């Protein structure tokens, strides 16, 4: 397989060790800065719930998407870098991100 960032991180983070996940996004910002999004702009989640929040600013993100010829155990990904607003669903106390709803 290829040694691109996506192939490597998806494996290291236990996302493709036992299957090939179609898509995943990695955020390159401090953990605390991402957690801070839970008190930023309140927006509706795709499912209709209102516990989602959109970051005020764009953040550095890497999008990982399976190629058309990807097949377990040899998962293969296309790596795309971008700067976009993230939308996260938050829950609990402390009020932190538990799901990524999207990226604008």
């Amino acid at each position: 397989s290829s040694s691109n960032y996506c192939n490597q991180m998806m494996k290291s983070r236990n996302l493709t060790k036992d299957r090939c996940k179609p898509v995943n996004t990695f955020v390159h910002e401090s953990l605390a800065d991402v957690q801070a999004v839970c008190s930023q702009k309140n927006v509706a989640c795709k499912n209709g719930q209102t516990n989602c929040y959109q970051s005020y600013s764009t953040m550095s993100i890497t999008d990982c998407r399976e190629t058309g010829s990807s097949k377990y155990p040899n998962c293969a990904y296309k790596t795309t870098q971008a700067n976009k607003h993230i939308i996260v669903a938050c829950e609990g106390n402390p009020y932190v991100p538990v799901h990524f709803d999207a990226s604008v």
């Binding site: 991180m9 983070r13 236990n14 996302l15 995943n24 996004t25 990695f26 955020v27 390159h28 910002e29 401090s30 953990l31 991402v34 890497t62 996260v88 829950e91 609990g92 932190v96 991100p97 538990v98 799901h99 990524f100």
Partner: peptide
């Protein structure tokens, strides 16, 4: 086990 918050960090954060 792994909490929802922990899972989100493992799957999406690369500080």
């Amino acid at each position: 086990k792994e909490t929802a918050a922990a899972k989100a960090e493992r799957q999406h954060l690369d500080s």
